[PDB]
Amino acid sequence: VNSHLSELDEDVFHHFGFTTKSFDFKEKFGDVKFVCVCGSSGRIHNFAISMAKLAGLPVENIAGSHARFVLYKVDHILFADHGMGIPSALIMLHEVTKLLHYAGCKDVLFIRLGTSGGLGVKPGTIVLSDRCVNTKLEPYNELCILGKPVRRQTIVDLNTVNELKKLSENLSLECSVVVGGTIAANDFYEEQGRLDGSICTFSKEEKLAFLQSAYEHGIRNMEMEGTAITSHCYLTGHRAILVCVTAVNRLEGDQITISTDEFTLFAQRPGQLVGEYLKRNNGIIVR
Amino acid sequence: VNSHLSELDEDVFHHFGFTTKSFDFKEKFGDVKFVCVCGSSGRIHNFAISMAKLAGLPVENIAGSHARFVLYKVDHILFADHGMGIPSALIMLHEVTKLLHYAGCKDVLFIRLGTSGGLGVKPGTIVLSDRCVNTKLEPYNELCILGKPVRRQTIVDLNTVNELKKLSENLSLECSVVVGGTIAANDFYEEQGRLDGSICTFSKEEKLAFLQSAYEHGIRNMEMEGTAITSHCYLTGHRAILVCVTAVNRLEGDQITISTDEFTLFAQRPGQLVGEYLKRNNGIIV
Ligand SMILES: O=c1[nH]cc(F)c(=O)[nH]1
Ligand SMILES: O=c1[nH]cc(F)c(=O)[nH]1
Q: How many domains does chain A have?
């Protein structure tokens, strides 16, 4: 545990815009067993609204006025956004895991409901990550702490992934549910092998050798935070999974050509699976 | 210029929610000579609104409604947010610099208006970066492209920095303006030497040895995107500066203990200086 936290009279959650004196954390958050996250404040809000409807229950922002992130709560589930990229995700992760610790919450499941680029699967596919790796296909998150290199192993809650897959096989979703590996990259364009950024120093041949090699190593999609979420939660005593929809088949192209409406439809598909899971696993109270 | 863009009949700006077919880019953006950016959509909008008032001109969002980023324009200035951290900033950088390319804009100045942790300066101090380095004080942005390590030199437009410093002396700011080095970190907590994250593997003494050393190497503040902005712009034919206020003295602590109201006042100080600069040098029409 971080003993330095005891030195504080009050802990200011800078990016959520509240402090430990804002509410009673044990009373307020003590019953939380799940945290659902994604890059979009609007989308995670909508998801929380859907969970409230399922709970038979407005879903009001718990975060303060000038916060970078939103925070909602529906029964035993916390909802937060985390922007895009490992650094932004680590800001959310630090402050939410502190919150959870202060509330007395242990062994919480974090669920990332994101969007991603697919490898060898159709757009709209749900990929359940069975491992999260960097762009060198290594299951580690890399950090530089006090100027020194550190690596933290990525651990996916595989027992839960398998339960979700089994669940999906018994459901009627309008998409395939693929279990496979997930590359987290530190950019949307060049690090993801895109030819269509403002800069590109490689050929299509080199792009496809990179992506096809990843495919052969079991990778089925690519996003920007996976290695942060699945390394940090384990180290703070929690569990984590990634449930991402694909928005493009990167073996065919780079551009996101589907409509805004179609993208929104696709992005809601992880929530449709996960929502029923949460319902069956005491995420909400069925009223 | 990326030759592969000519392989697109249409170029979708995914995170801005429009396309090359959405506008006549030459007609709409051709006059842009400045891009002001920061992590907050609300704060960059308020700054654009302030520049609009200066120009004597509602500032409407140009980006799509379901977009990750906002985009505004006041005369020759473009405004956008970029979230927090290098990956997010790179997303804005690629799409905005493509936009400028399509619009025929050349030698544009990117201005990041951020907040930061200070080293040995008082909270509310404006730091003008005269270099942007990683946590090892190296003037490079690091990338892993097709799984291979790539480094890109950071280049701050120093001529503009010097002009800003000189300008600030002639203004009446309630703060000091310091030219100094800026560290970009891939985290707010552990990578910035904070003792107050959910994980900490070091002591107060190890924190202070690390930051005091950086101070001695001329670092005066610390944020999360400097190396991306100052390496990317140069390589795409543009210029870039960082103008960041400090919200805490990291040699004294980690927590941001100033009120939300004071933080907001502080966060507006970069725009106050930069706006005077843009007003003098053809950012707007008065
Ligand atoms: O990080 C990503 N998010 C969403 C995508 F569609 C993609 O290709 N990459
Ligand atoms: O990246 C940062 N932004 C703002 C701060 F106050 C800080 O310490 N670090």
A: 1
Resolution of this deposited model, Å = 2.0
Q: Report the CATH number at residue A139.
A: 3.40.50.1580
Q: Which long-range contacts (CB under 8 A, 24 or more apart) does A211-219 make?
A: A211/A119, A211/A250, A211/A251, A212/A251, A214/A119, A214/A137, A214/A181, A214/A183, A215/A119, A215/A120, A215/A251, A217/A137, A217/A181, A218/A130, A218/A131, A218/A180, A218/A181, A219/A119, A219/A133, A219/A137, A219/A180, A219/A181, A219/A182, A219/A183
Query: How many alpha carbons fall within 13 Å on the CB side of residue B216?
Result: 6
Residue of A174, A85, A54, A78 lying closest to A126 (CA atoms): A174
DSSP A50: H
Which residue on chain B is closest to A186 by alpha carbon? B87
Buried-exposed string B144-158: b where 16+ CB fall within 10 A, e elsewhere:
bbbbeeeebebbbbe
Q: Whose CA is closest to B269, among B116, B134, B85? A: B116
Find the domain containing A272 and state its range: 1-287
SS3 label, residue A81: strand
Contacts of A67 in chain B (CB under 8 A): none
Contact across the interface for A12 and B144, Cβ inside 8 Å: no
Phi, psi angle pair for B34, to nearest 5°: -140, 145
Q: How far apart are CA A125 and CA A250, in angstroms?
A: 13
- Name the residue with tokens 């922007």: A83
- The tokens for B79 are 């405004």
Rounded Cα distance between B95 and A197, Å, is: 7
Asked whether A125 and A178 are in contact (CB, 8 A), the reply is: yes
Out of A42, A65, A146, the one facing B210 most closely (by C-beta) is A146
Q: Could you tell which of B220, B223, B242, B244 is best to mutate to test the pocket of ligand 2, judged by most ligand atoms within 8 Å of the CB?
A: B223
* Ramachandran assignment for B35, one of left (phi > 0), alpha (psi -120 to 50 degrees), beta (any other): beta
B173: amino acid identity, one letter: L
- DSSP letter for A108, please: P
Whether A134 has its CB under 8 Å from any CB of chain B: the answer is yes
Elucidated via: X-ray
